[PDB]
């Protein structure tokens, strides 16, 4: 749970 990491499905 870091805000700026990949927020997408894969």
């Amino acid at each position, epitope marked *: *749970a870091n*805000p*700026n*990491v*990949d*927020p*997408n*499905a*894969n």
Partner: antibody
Amino acid sequence: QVLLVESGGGVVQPGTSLRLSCVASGFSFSTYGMHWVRQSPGKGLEWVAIIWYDGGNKFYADSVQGRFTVSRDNSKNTLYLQMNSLRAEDTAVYYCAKAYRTSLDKKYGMDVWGQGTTVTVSS
Amino acid sequence: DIQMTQSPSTLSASVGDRVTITCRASQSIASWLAWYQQKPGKAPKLLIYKASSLESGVPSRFSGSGSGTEFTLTISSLHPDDFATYFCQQFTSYWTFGQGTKVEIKR
């Protein structure tokens, strides 16, 4: 083409609640993180919230933490921003934005924004 | 908290002029910098991503440079459609924006 359209803005009384909506088309909504950003003359462009593709991870700006809640209904291709305990400093144009696509990068911004919806807090 | 500051705040230039906008971050953001263009009544539009990479459809007259704390956005020859407000944005720790640089038409 990727397109986002915000709705739900308007004139609202202080201390009340309001839910904004962001509708997505032209891409697989269920596979992308989504953002809310707001713009006011007083505070410029200010990020508000982000929600993960699956609706799980959610992060908020300090200015809105505890009062605003982000959600999404992937079956309706719709992103939501629930705003509670609204105050005058929340008056702004609220934009919704799509997270940048997955790459080898470890940090992610946003590419496409919507037209925006105007929220005016006034008595 | 990373604070982005831009310079100039307002610029008056003629069509065909070369314009350079500078953005400074309070701490090192490596190359996690993006440049947006915003016209009145319209949403911001992404022009450059990760400091130097031009987005699809953006004319090659736009270019970006820099790493760490100092970044620049360059328009080689201004077109009437380029007169707008330009924002920088860091995306390494949350997402914060500069105050904007308004490029107005000199006549």
